[PDB]
Design an enzyme around this catalytic site. Structure first.
Site, PDB file in Angstrom:
ATOM      1  CD  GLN A  11      -1.984   2.214   1.713  1.00  0.00           C
ATOM      2  OE1 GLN A  11      -1.343   2.280   2.642  1.00  0.00           O
ATOM      3  NE2 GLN A  11      -3.068   2.995   1.230  1.00  0.00           N
TER       4      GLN A  11
ATOM      5  CD  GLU B 118      -7.461  -2.944   0.408  1.00  0.00           C
ATOM      6  OE1 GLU B 118      -6.776  -2.203   0.114  1.00  0.00           O
ATOM      7  OE2 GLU B 118      -8.834  -2.858   0.553  1.00  0.00           O
TER       8      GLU B 118
ATOM      9  CB  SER C 263       5.710  -0.418   3.343  1.00  0.00           C
ATOM     10  OG  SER C 263       5.666  -0.423   4.820  1.00  0.00           O
TER      11      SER C 263
ATOM     12  CB  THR D 288       0.390  -7.793   0.915  1.00  0.00           C
ATOM     13  OG1 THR D 288       0.297  -7.985  -0.577  1.00  0.00           O
ATOM     14  CG2 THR D 288       0.057  -6.552   1.364  1.00  0.00           C
TER      15      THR D 288
ATOM     16  CG  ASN E 139       3.697   9.215  -0.814  1.00  0.00           C
ATOM     17  OD1 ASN E 139       4.346   8.182   0.016  1.00  0.00           O
ATOM     18  ND2 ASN E 139       2.685   9.581  -0.547  1.00  0.00           N
TER      19      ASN E 139
ATOM     20  CD  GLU F  11      30.078   4.650 -13.688  1.00  0.00           C
ATOM     21  OE1 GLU F  11      30.655   4.890 -15.041  1.00  0.00           O
ATOM     22  OE2 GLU F  11      30.838   4.060 -12.872  1.00  0.00           O
TER      23      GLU F  11
HETATM   24  N1  GTP Z   1       6.634   6.635   4.242  1.00  0.00           N
HETATM   25  C1  GTP Z   1       5.398   5.953   3.944  1.00  0.00           C
HETATM   26  N2  GTP Z   1       5.192   4.792   4.530  1.00  0.00           N
HETATM   27  C2  GTP Z   1       3.969   4.356   4.432  1.00  0.00           C
HETATM   28  C3  GTP Z   1       2.959   4.780   3.569  1.00  0.00           C
HETATM   29  N3  GTP Z   1       1.722   3.970   3.510  1.00  0.00           N
HETATM   30  C4  GTP Z   1       1.950   3.067   4.316  1.00  0.00           C
HETATM   31  N4  GTP Z   1       3.387   3.358   4.845  1.00  0.00           N
HETATM   32  C5  GTP Z   1       4.012   2.294   5.726  1.00  0.00           C
HETATM   33  O1  GTP Z   1       3.505   1.130   5.727  1.00  0.00           O
HETATM   34  C6  GTP Z   1       3.084   0.357   7.109  1.00  0.00           C
HETATM   35  C7  GTP Z   1       2.064  -0.753   6.933  1.00  0.00           C
HETATM   36  O2  GTP Z   1       1.806  -1.342   5.667  1.00  0.00           O
HETATM   37  P1  GTP Z   1       1.015  -0.794   4.405  1.00  0.00           P
HETATM   38  O3  GTP Z   1       1.824  -0.128   3.512  1.00  0.00           O
HETATM   39  O4  GTP Z   1       0.028   0.094   5.033  1.00  0.00           O
HETATM   40  O5  GTP Z   1       0.262  -2.090   3.870  1.00  0.00           O
HETATM   41  P2  GTP Z   1       1.062  -3.166   3.055  1.00  0.00           P
HETATM   42  O6  GTP Z   1       2.811  -2.761   3.309  1.00  0.00           O
HETATM   43  O7  GTP Z   1       0.788  -3.264   1.815  1.00  0.00           O
HETATM   44  O8  GTP Z   1       0.788  -4.718   4.045  1.00  0.00           O
HETATM   45  P3  GTP Z   1      -0.795  -4.733   4.414  1.00  0.00           P
HETATM   46  O9  GTP Z   1      -0.943  -4.030   5.760  1.00  0.00           O
HETATM   47  O10 GTP Z   1      -1.057  -6.294   4.717  1.00  0.00           O
HETATM   48  O11 GTP Z   1      -1.553  -4.336   3.301  1.00  0.00           O
HETATM   49  C8  GTP Z   1       2.878   1.484   7.769  1.00  0.00           C
HETATM   50  O12 GTP Z   1       3.540   1.189   8.955  1.00  0.00           O
HETATM   51  C9  GTP Z   1       3.577   2.675   7.293  1.00  0.00           C
HETATM   52  O13 GTP Z   1       4.855   2.883   7.890  1.00  0.00           O
HETATM   53  C10 GTP Z   1       3.261   6.233   2.962  1.00  0.00           C
HETATM   54  O14 GTP Z   1       2.473   6.660   2.101  1.00  0.00           O
HETATM   55  N5  GTP Z   1       4.630   6.776   3.126  1.00  0.00           N
HETATM   56 MG    MG Z   2      -1.606  -4.294   1.232  1.00  0.00          MG
END
Ligand code: GTP
Ligand code: MG
Ligand code: GDP
Ligand code: GDP
Ligand code: GDP
Lengths: 430, 108, 439, 49, 430, 430
Positions: free
Chosen positions: C11, C71, C140, C145, C228, C254
């Site tokens: 996500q 998702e 992340s 996932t 972002n 490089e």
């Molecule tokens: N820097 C940054 N981190 C994000 C952002 N969106 C989600 N995260 C990080 O992602 C972590 C949670 O995972 P998600 O990205 O929300 O979802 P996922 O990684 O696809 O895993 P699922 O929860 O199973 O869907 C959070 O602790 C955030 O730190 C974002 O827009 N910017």
């Molecule tokens: Mg997800």
């Protein structure tokens, strides 16, 4: 008539050549379209040394352009005087070396150098009487330092009796922009001492010092530095192209500047240099030219020549003057600084005069000196090399292409032997 | 080391007060010439800089635009002849004919 | 003719991808629909956009990237947003159930039926390009996932493509600021997978950027959009050398050749300068000296780590704008004279500097101002082991009592994976320790 | 002590040989030139078939 | 031929040198652009004494400007005739001396003196035949009194046989412009007595008296004082540049004026100085010129010559006259002022004649005298020094830069000794 | 032939010897194992002056180590060059002296000195023809300051004719490590004045000033200071071990340096001292060497040598040069600084020369000057002593080991007498 071809590769080499031939074309009065628009017949009598002949009376380079990525040639094609170059002479790779000597000398170089070797062989057989080769490149980069030196080795194996010149620009510890430069620098110098007949060392830090101190202009660029290097290059081959009081070719320079076959590294300088806010206040005379000749700060190398003893020195004067003042100035400078000259080579100074000054100048001086002060630069480079090598840092890249530490050890050993043999011939008395 | 003040009253005109010398002091009239020449030169360009003193600093330099054949004609600097706009996409590559190949020849 | 392939998994990965593609679409002047609006555009050799876009044979241009997520909400949001006409319809792969923050879900059970389609898409997009430079991946760590699909795709690509360069801009959990409660587990698993399958790994911790935004832009409540946008700026500054001419250009190949001394160590952290608001942009000097001094300040790190506790081994700096090599060299000399920053013994020179002419572009409606000089910095330092040690502490404190481990054993993966991954991380910390010792 | 002194003395008695013949392109070209100058005559001797 | 170079440091030295160069350019007929617009051929016969020639035929003075703050020289380039000086002859610091002899002579003065020494060595070696050096500076300031005397010591170390003229504007207590004057004045006169071949003292109070009394101008300003000093200093060396009947150079003056090596402090005078009211109403005759010359109030020194006996005097007449009347006037002034001339030496006044008068005038006289009346300046400086030093006021600024009060003790002792050995000839009888 | 035996005591003397033997062995080509590895024959003819022969060809020093704490001994033995010493020469106590001069001179020193007397008599008998004894110690300690002086007294009792010299590291008040320094310093100097034939004082303050100024090294150490003192202490015995134009042994120096029998305290210096980052240029010719000699702030003592008048001076040059520049420069110094030299001893400089320069130098010199300046150090030591003694502070331990106030009062009376009689020669006139 004893013409010379041009070879160049790498981004630095291409940038050097792009302006060097601009300087040469300006000197010989050739427009960017390749049509003669000069003033005197002398500018055309000896045109064949650098320029070939084409349909319509235009002239084309005998220069070869080499690199592993197309960006540099894409840039050089669209620059001023870019229409002269024959499109055939461009040979370019699709990958790039990535600052890797092993990649530029073992993996991509092996299959890419065949085409450039064929091209240079055709160019060499084209001329009636070849005189020699000149290479211009950087030893801090990957593509240049690998493929240029492999080509040097190949051409040495193919043409034994010809002369080779190498305008080598070597990275310095002060103005450093690459982390793995000591490795490929040492490898390049070890392979290069084995084949190069003459070497001229150029330092970007020294050039920056020249521009900051002498020209006193706040914001130069790489273009001005390339211009200085190009003027130095055009100086050495002037007498071969124009008449003069004392004729002199690169073979004569080698004979009078090479005491021993392993001692073939020189430092070059140009005169006169002056800021635009001080041009009206200086008189061009042989004393001023010769005092700016031998000033330590004027040199284009990081080596301070007063830390050692000159073995040999040469001078090319351009313009009209009598031989008497030049000869007496040489005698005077040899007498006043006897401590800075080796004692078992009396009369270690050579002179030549050409009566055609550069366009827009009346007198000019080119200096090429072989002295023992160069060894400090090799000493520093070897210090950095061993410091990085004891810990085997960044070694996996080089080991990934069949290379091992055998050639590392032998190259550093050969380089230390070279430093020792410079030190020996400096610390010796009759 | 002085005010050059010129005014009708003699106690503060300098040129009237410097006239005791056996000769004419080349300095006063030279400054007169510099002022009048500077005014004319400023007339050519158009500056009206709230007083003549601002441009007199650099209306006196004798430095020529180009070199006078005692140094390499490197010019005043490549950076000097540069002009900069800042629209996106101005510095993209061009891929000239020398690097413009299509067909990737099949054989050697 | 040089192109890179972008992977956005998770996500957070999709959210980062949205902003970076907005920036890329703007900077080449691509309209949101996808077609060139100037109508003065010419053919021939003006195909600079080829590094990111591809000509579609009729009109528009399609980005060279893929979106993966199990998702469907974020993918549906992209498909209904303002960029509906930009992306290829069958390029945003959507799952059906979320992994629900479980690594086993995305690595053993569900991701197997999505990885095949993703790989097919990658292959069919890849044969299109001819000058493949490499792959950039965004993920992340602290998400089920995200971590699972990232690991599985990395293992598949490492054997399907081989020697192609891989750069992973990974979002590790913060040492104290975190959302989930089970992220140490799948972070351990993801690190174990990623250690021997990625060529460059870049830290993208969150609270560091939070602090930077609060300190510089004077924003009290930044959201993920600002994060972002800064990430997009960093990526653009990294990549601009491949599509804009400059005095000293660099390539993807490089960086690893001048930044990682050993194959095992490939983790490093970044910085960007300057970060200036519109009102701030006036009353300041903005010279290379001050921007390069700001780039090395510990508060400007993109990750919550203090380099003063460790040594430096390599750093690559890319300048964009009207900078000059002499000035950057003088700044380097001043840095080397500075004593607060010290380097390892066996690296006398550790600076790889590149210069590009194109000044950064500004996104309308953004927060950051614009100046014509910017610097992006990628340093690898010994101090990075601090975050691994903290995450190890988190893992130990809950693995002592075997918490939540039933929802890891119940999806087929054995409990023995935790010990193996822990040992691998311990060995990595060992190596990062002895690498910094003096001879 | 006696054996160490013997070793040091016998090693110190050996040093003065320099005889500089650094030879890469010099000797390669020397071989080429001598080969040409020698084999020209041996080319102009052959009994025709 | 037998040319001399010029060096100036400090604000006062810079102003004096600028005005002197304007005057010399006027006399030899050079425009502010450096191009000859003279009338008679005599203006070019000996032009090489004070100017070198450059490209385009423009002449540049061989002068060196030195200081620690770029303000004064930045002003002198802006002023008229500021374009004559070559930009390379400007050397400047960035901190300033702050009226501190220690700063200007020990730490940063020694730090900076290398470049100026290089430049002066270059200029001295460039010319054909040196004749001597001439320095103009102040003892009451910091940068002048320190760095100038350090340069004097250095240059005397390298050229032991050449003559050295110094134009020192010593302090006077009536016209006070700084509180720490006696300290650095004493130090500089100490370091100067053993090296300077001739010192000539000039007093701002004395010049103020001249302007208010003889010239009777309402509002004089430093330009007038600078210009009078320039006129006298130019008249010192008229015979070396122009033809005459009895040529006399600097060494001739030294031999005629120096009976003993440590007696070389002189006081100067210029004639004729006429008010604004009677420039058409006074005849120009040798009697009138000598009467105005010998007047005590006409001297450029606060000391009254009437309080001492001249050891030796010299006069340099300019223009056309009769040598016999010159001699008769000298003989009359010697007989009727026998009480004011030391008896045990006969005919202690020298006369020289040059054929070219100053521009715009018919006849002129430059007078240089060695007498015992100079002791008063040293006496007052020394008593101020001791009265200020017994309390050790302002001493820590000096002593905090590696400097010690014992050299102050030696300076005071040496000045007392010099005063004693300079005055014992006042009462010494044959 | 005419060897001198080395005896060192206390931590100061032990550290001094640790570097003296290092420097001497380096000069004479001796390894840590006593193995000769020199190149020239001249290193061995006079090696018997400092070394004795052992079976197998090894050379061992004739040095006697004495102390009260074994810690110094096993610290110095474990270091490099520690195996040269014969263990039978080590003599040390087990209870220490605790910087108590009384305890070291009356209680434990007398009890322990028997063995060291036996060993020193053994060495003196073993040597073929005894030339003298040389001691190194400090007055800032207790054990040294007591047992040294007692040993000198007794050995002079047994050998009233043979010369002897001692080096004393005297305490300084600005950097002082003991409150007992005045007491034991006064007692030891009282004992030494009537016993030591030569005494040479060293100031750690002056050493710190030197290493901070002329070496420009940021971090000095006790090893560095010991190296400096060892260089000076090696220089004095140059011509005794090596040939030269004018050999001048210790007896010659004693004859030529002392006017009256009670005036045998010396301050010394060494030259040249160049910076660590010394650029490669020129050579150390006689003028700069002799100027750096007489720079009063080059002396290794805190006493200001220009505060008084030099009784005599001595120079030991080392290297090959003529004596004409030698004596003319010494006369030049005489004439230029005649105020610093007392008049009734004209031509009061010793000149001596040795042909073998120090290792790594072409020219060098050691200076040893007897001047009226040391009286200030004695005055300040006496002032501190009487200030501490007026209320009898710290006196009760000194009284608790057998002596009373009579020794202190007679010592201070003798000190005052010495200072007074030393000063009358300062103002005495011819
Ligand atoms: N820097 C940054 N981190 C994000 C952002 N969106 C989600 N995260 C990080 O992602 C972590 C949670 O995972 P998600 O990205 O929300 O979802 P996922 O990684 O696809 O895993 P699922 O929860 O199973 O869907 C959070 O602790 C955030 O730190 C974002 O827009 N910017
Ligand atoms: Mg997800
Ligand atoms: N003097 C000078 N140096 C240059 C120029 N272009 C590049 N360089 C130097 O070359 C180095 C980089 O070399 P590189 O391009 O990697 O060599 P290549 O890999 O063979 O093309 C830089 O450190 C520059 O200092 C130029 O035009 N003039
Ligand atoms: N006659 C004259 N005296 C000057 C001039 N400028 C400064 N002075 C004198 O110089 C003194 C100050 O010396 P200063 O410039 O501070 O010396 P410096 O610091 O070494 O340059 C003042 O007391 C002035 O009387 C000038 O143009 N003409
Ligand atoms: N120059 C020098 N001085 C030393 C050294 N060791 C000690 N000192 C000085 O000796 C003084 C102390 O002497 P101390 O050790 O008590 O003498 P001891 O009682 O005989 O051992 C200190 O003030 C030091 O300055 C040394 O190695 N070199």
């Amino acid at each position: 008539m004893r013409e010379i071809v041009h070879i160049q590769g790498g981004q630095c080499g291409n940038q050097i050549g792009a302006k060097f031939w601009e300087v040469i074309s300006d000197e010989h009065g050739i427009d960017p379209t390749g049509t003669y628009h000069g003033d005197s017949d002398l500018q055309l009598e000896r045109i064949n040394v650098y320029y070939n002949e084409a349909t319509g009376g235009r002239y084309v380079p005998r220069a070869i352009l080499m690199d592993l990525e197309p960006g540099t040639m894409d840039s050089v094609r669209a620059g001023p005087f870019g229409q002269l170059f024959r499109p055939d002479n461009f040979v370019f790779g699709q990958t790039g070396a990535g600052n890797n000597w092993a990649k530029g000398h073992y993996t991509e170089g092996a299959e890419l150098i065949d085409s450039v070797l064929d091209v240079v062989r055709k160019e060499a057989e084209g001329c009636d009487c070849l005189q020699g080769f000149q290479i211009t490149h950087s030893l801090g980069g990957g593509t240049g330092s690998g493929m240029g030196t492999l080509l040097i080795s190949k051409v040495r194996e193919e043409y034994p009796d010809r002369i080779m010149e190498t305008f080598s620009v070597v990275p310095s510890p002060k103005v450093s922009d690459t982390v793995v430069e000591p490795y490929n620098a040492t490898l390049s110098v070890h392979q290069l001492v084995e084949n190069a007949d003459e070497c001229m060392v150029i330092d970007n830090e020294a050039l920056y010092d020249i521009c900051f101190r002498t020209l006193k202009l706040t914001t130069p660029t790489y273009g001005d530095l390339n211009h200085l290097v190009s003027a130095a290059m055009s100086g050495v081959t002037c007498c071969l192209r124009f008449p003069g009081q004392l004729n002199s070719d690169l073979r004569k320079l080698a004979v009078n500047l090479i005491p021993f076959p392993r001692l073939h590294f020189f430092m070059i300088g140009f005169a006169p240099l002056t800021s635009r806010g001080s041009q009206q206040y200086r008189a061009l005379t042989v004393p001023e030219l010769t005092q700016q000749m031998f000033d330590a700060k004027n040199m284009m190398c990081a080596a301070d020549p007063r830390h050692g003893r000159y073995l040999t020195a040469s001078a090319l004067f351009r313009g009209r003057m009598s031989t008497k003042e030049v000869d007496e100035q040489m005698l005077n400078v040899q007498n006043k600084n006897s401590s800075y000259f080796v004692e078992w080579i009396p009369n270690n100074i050579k002179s030549s005069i050409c009566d055609i000054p550069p366009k827009g100048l009346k007198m000019a001086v080119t200096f090429v000196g072989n002295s023992t002060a160069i060894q400090e630069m090799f000493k520093r480079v070897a210090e950095q090399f061993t410091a990085m090598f004891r810990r085997k840092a960044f070694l996996h890249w080089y080991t990934g292409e069949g290379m091992d530490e055998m050639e590392f050890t032998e190259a550093e050993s050969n380089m230390n032997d070279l430093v020792s043999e410079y030190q020996q011939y400096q610390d010796a008395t009759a | 080391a002085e005010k050059y003040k010129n005014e009708q009253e003699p106690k503060d005109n300098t040129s009237i007060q410097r006239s005791w010398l056996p000769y004419k002091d080349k300095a006063l009239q030279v400054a007169e010439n510099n002022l009048i020449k500077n005014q004319t030169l400023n007339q050519t360009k158009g500056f009206t800089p709230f007083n003549p003193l601002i441009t007199y600093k650099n209306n006196m330099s004798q430095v020529q635009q180009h070199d006078i054949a005692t140094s390499l004609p490197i010019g005043s600097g490549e950076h000097s002849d540069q002009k900069r706009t800042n629209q996106p996409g101005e510095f993209r590559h061009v891929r000239t004919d020398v690097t413009l190949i299509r067909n990737k020849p099949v054989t050697k | 003719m040089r192109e890179v392939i972008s992977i956005h998994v998770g996500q957070g990965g999709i959210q980062v991808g949205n902003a970076c593609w907005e920036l890329f679409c703007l900077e080449h002047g691509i309209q949101p629909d996808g077609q060139m609006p100037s109508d003065k555009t010419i053919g021939g050799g003006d195909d600079a956009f080829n590094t990111f876009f591809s000509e579609t044979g009729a009109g528009k241009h399609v980005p060279r990237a893929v979106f993966l997520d199990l998702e469907p909400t974020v993918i549906d949001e992209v498909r209904t947003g303002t960029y509906r006409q930009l992306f290829h319809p069958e390029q945003l792969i959507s799952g059906k159930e979320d992994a629900a923050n479980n690594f086993a879900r995305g690595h053993y059970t569900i991701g197997k039926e999505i990885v095949d389609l993703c790989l097919d898409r990658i292959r069919k997009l890849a044969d299109n390009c001819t000058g493949l430079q490499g792959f950039l991946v965004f993920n992340s760590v602290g998400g089920g996932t995200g971590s699972g699909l990232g690991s599985l795709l990395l293992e598949r690509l490492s054997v399907d493509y081989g020697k192609k360069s891989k750069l992973g801009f990974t979002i590790y959990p913060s040492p104290q600021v975190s959302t989930a409660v089970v992220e140490p587990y799948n972070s351990i698993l993801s690190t174990h997978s990623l250690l021997e399958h990625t060529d460059v790994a870049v830290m993208l911790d969150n609270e560091a950027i939070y602090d930077i935004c609060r300190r510089n832009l004077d924003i009290e409540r930044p959201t993920y959009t600002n994060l972002n946008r800064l990430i997009a700026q960093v990526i653009s500054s990294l990549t601009a050398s491949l599509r804009f001419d400059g005095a000293l250009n660099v390539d993807i190949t490089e960086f690893q050749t001048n930044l990682v001394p050993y194959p095992r160590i490939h983790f490093m952290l970044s910085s960007y300068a300057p970060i200036i608001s519109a009102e701030k942009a006036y009353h300041e000097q903005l010279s290379v000296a001050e921007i390069t001094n700001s780039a090395f300040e510990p508060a400007n790190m993109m990750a919550k780590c203090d380099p003063r506790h460790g040594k430096y081994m390599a750093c690559s700096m890319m300048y964009r704008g009207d900078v000059v090599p002499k000035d950057v060299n003088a700044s380097i000399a001043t840095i080397k004279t500075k004593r607060t920053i010290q380097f390892v013994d066996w690296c006398p020179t550790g600076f790889k500097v590149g210069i590009n002419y194109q000044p950064p572009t500004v996104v309308p409606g953004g927060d950051l101002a614009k100046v014509m000089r910017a610097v992006c910095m990628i340093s690898n330092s010994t101090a990075i082991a601090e975050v691994f040690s903290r995450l190890d502490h988190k893992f130990d404190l809950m693995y002592a009592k075997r918490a939540f481990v039933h929802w890891y054993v119940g999806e087929g993966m054995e409990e023995g994976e935790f010990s193996e991954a822990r040992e691998d991380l311990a060995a990595l910390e060992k190596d990062y320790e002895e690498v910094g010792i003096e001879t | 002590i006696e054996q160490d002194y013997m070793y040091r003395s016998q090693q110190d008695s050996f040093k003065p040989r320099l005889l500089p013949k650094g030879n890469k392109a010099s000797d390669l070209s020397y071989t080429y030139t001598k080969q040409k100058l020698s084999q020209i005559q041996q080319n102009n001797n052959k009994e025709l078939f």
